[PDB]
Point group: C6
Chain length 65, copies 6
């Protein structure tokens, strides 16, 4: 589920909200991702460790997961 | 496994659930789908929840 | 393997327990079943608790 | 080659200890037994503590 | 090469880009990435400190870094 | 060096440098690194306390260590 879900968000360049395990909310678009991290873009590309992520919430409906 | 049949029952019966995160935050919705690492929870949009950030999955009502 | 016999004892005897999560929050009920990754705790409904989010399992009385 | 000899000495000598959890909570008692994943701590009852939720084990005296 | 993580931290290290590393607690560390392995990142400032990746939420470059 | 963690901790233990170990909850521990293995670090002060690496966020030497 994970690969198809993130790939879709990446392909459609959908604005997303990534919430961390501390409650903090990051926003931007998914540039790329691998087994352990997600590169999130906004002013700069920041590397987010999936282990610190709780949820990835599309800013709008995204068909075909 | 106990996890799969529990989540599969909830998904199949479209039982509204509360998913508590390890930080105490509570998410609500219906389980759309899930794999070994995540659960897609539906409400306005489908959000992807990482199981490693989940503490407990509480059905809103008994599930056979 | 201490886990299995410890949880089995609690389940078998239907001893009320307190499961403290890693955020400090306490859950209570009886252990219905469990596997390598989760424990099904019962009270009003059966709720699925991920062991990775559990800090300690405390029985309400000696077992 | 450290964790086990450290835990065994504590259990063997029944040294009172404080186990700090990652949430800040401090548990106290004597280590009854342990395996690769949990530690059984005794006080009023035996509670099962998950090592993944433990931050530090502080003996109450030099061991 | 095989991950996004290696090339990304290598770029930062190589370019000696000042960075901010946010921990799961919320503390914000800063400095330059001296080195890193499978499990930790050495961050330099007054001293080299060792940060466990499992405690890291994000690594944010202070400026755009290409490639 | 395939591992960075091992030589870093070893230098600290060898030189007996006072360090600060910050835990994931924000709490800070201090003392000297007596020993360590794959999963824990033995920190000394009044007593030897066993710290699980998975609970550690950062190890900060109190001074430069060559």
């Amino acid at each position: 589920l994970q690969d198809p879900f993130l790939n879709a968000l990446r392909r459609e360049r959908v604005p997303v909200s990534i919430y961390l395990v501390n409650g903090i909310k990051l926003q931007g678009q998914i540039e790329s991702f691998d087994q352990f991290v997600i590169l999130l873009k906004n002013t700069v590309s920041q590397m987010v460790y999936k282990h610190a992520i709780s949820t990835v919430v599309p800013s709008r409906p995204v068909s075909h997961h």
